[PDB]
Design a protein around this ligand. Structure first.
Ligand code: NAD
Ligand code: NAD
Lengths: 290, 291
């Protein structure tokens, strides 16, 4: 006996993911499994789209009436030119990773920061009204620092090395202090004495850099274990490995820890809720993915 | 060893589109997604509501998206050549495109309905190559069939159609056939029953390529009387919903061998499937699932 098994028919609609490289992404599995579970007639697909293709793809998407899509490197900071509106965070961050189409009007959103903050809250970590020291000034750190500010974190000390992102960090600081009530400051990651004071004075220490992840597995920006203390919360955006070097040291010091699994899941949920006004079953998806 | 990921669509899966409007009740996506699943090809087929105002932006967007290919239907078949790079011989002579394939950034337009019709006949043991056909219709499907038929080597084709918007198209099709193929084509009024009787009597096959037999015209047929048919004559209809139109009902009763449009539909898909993947769609397996 043989019958129809494909849930994809002429009624099925598309949610995209446009970036490059991108085909190894886990996001399609996340959303497809989420749609399947909820009985939603959508499929999610990734497309290799870069600078040269971006304008055409978005015009194409409007013409195809797509409900929305994700956007990843190297399009996140450029896509606003082809959108109609931006969420407060996208406008403040200057990056878009999620687009939604409402009656032809394209609104750009940024869900990485939201996801990160949500994952903390779900993990039972309250950093609202408290201080955070964070490493990094890239796409993720920026979204985290701004969403954190917008959510009510009182103070953020940012540490980054003197590379291509330091100037972005400076903007993040300036953006945070001028258009937010959160107080932010930037420090060189090599300023180890300042790093010590900032960590001691923070309820959370967060890695938002590629350090800890390939090609830097087994490496941490943390110079010494004695900069951590038992009550300190230590988090990392990295989740492959499930325990970075930083999170290993953290456990050894008695700290409570959290890798990036939560953040990737909840940034997916955010996107999903934006497109469907439904809650992604994170616990279910989590099981399926890991 | 457990693997709950039951969804075969990942960041690797590529897209084959269908652009037209209306188009969401189309069966094509089931057809290809089932074929892809069965063969293990990492592809998915989706439909998009695309019409005149959206066509140019969509095709330009599929190029940017580097899609492998897509199907095209009403009302885009005759306008799409404008945004393509090359056309198959049949696509250029027909002037319509229903299938596009992207080879290294170069988009080629193909027309598979005529190909699908002829293939279905051959699979059903009917050889009309070098013979005469009488056909009813002057719409997209009839035009594709007549032109492909001529290209495949049909010797002569008598076309019948009512005096509606399509008659002018028929005349054009006749001219295309006579001037660029070795086939002889003539056009007659469908209400000229005596010419119809004669053409059918001189043909090896009689084909309906109009919407008569299909709702809102079920139970109805353009064939004025059973008298015009005979046991040897092959009678075919492009319609397959219903699977047995009044025409095929009458033809059967007169001892004729019949064939509905179910093969045309399957083999039109098969052709597309083959232009895109260079593989054979398993028609037999897909027919079980669909119908
Ligand atoms: N959990 C999630 O869902 C999630 C989401 C986004 C990003 N991430 C992870 O966060 C990390 C950074 O992402 P991004 O998009 O912001 O990257 P990015 O390229 O935008 O930023 C790179 C950041 O890491 C720093 N950096 C890189 N190499 C370094 C080194 N050797 N020493 C010191 N600092 C270094 C840079 O200064 C900068 O702050 C990646 O590992 C990524 O996988 C995780
Ligand atoms: N088997 C397949 O895969 C396949 C593929 C394409 C079309 N079709 C079917 O073939 C039929 C025609 O397709 P098309 O796209 O060429 O249609 P079309 O709208 O382009 O053309 C309609 C044709 O039918 C004729 N017609 C319609 N109503 C009539 C009537 N009451 N009396 C006399 N003539 C009439 C017109 O004269 C014209 O030639 C439809 O029923 C369609 O569903 C089947």
């Amino acid at each position: 006996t043989n019958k129809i098994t494909e849930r994809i028919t002429g009624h099925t609609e598309l949610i995209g993911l446009i970036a490059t490289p991108i085909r190894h992404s886990l996001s399609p599995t996340m959303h497809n499994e989420a749609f399947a579970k909820l009985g939603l007639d959508y499929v999610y697909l990734a497309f290799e789209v870069g600078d040269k293709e971006l304008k055409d793809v978005v015009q194409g998407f409007r013409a195809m009436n797509l409900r929305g899509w994700n956007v990843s490197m190297p399009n996140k900071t450029n896509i606003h030119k082809y959108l109609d509106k931006l969420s407060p965070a996208a406008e403040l961050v200057g990056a878009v990773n999620t687009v939604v189409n409402d009656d032809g009007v394209l609104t750009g959103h940024i869900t990485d920061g939201t996801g990160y903050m949500r994952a903390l809250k779900e993990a039972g970590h309250d950093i609202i009204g408290k201080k955070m020291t964070i490493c990094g000034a890239g796409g993720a750190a920026t979204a985290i620092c701004i969403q954190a500010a917008l959510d009510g974190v009182k103070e953020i000390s940012i540490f980054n090395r003197k590379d291509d992102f330091y100037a972005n960090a400076e903007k993040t600081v300036e953006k945070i202090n001028s258009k937010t009530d959160c107080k932010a400051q930037l420090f060189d990651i090599e300023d180890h004495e300042q790093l010590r004071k900032e960590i001691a004075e923070s309820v959370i220490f967060t890695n938002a850099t590629g350090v800890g992840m390939k090609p830097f597995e087994g490496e941490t920006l943390l110079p010494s274990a004695d900069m951590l203390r038992p009550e300190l919360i230590v988090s990392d955006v990295v989740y492959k490995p499930t325990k970075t070097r930083l999170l290993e040291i953290a456990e050894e010091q008695g700290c409570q820890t959290l890798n990036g699994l939560g953040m990737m899941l909840w940034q997916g949920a955010k996107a999903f809720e934006i497109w469907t006004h439904k809650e992604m079953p994170v616990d279910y998806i989590k099981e399926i993915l890991f």
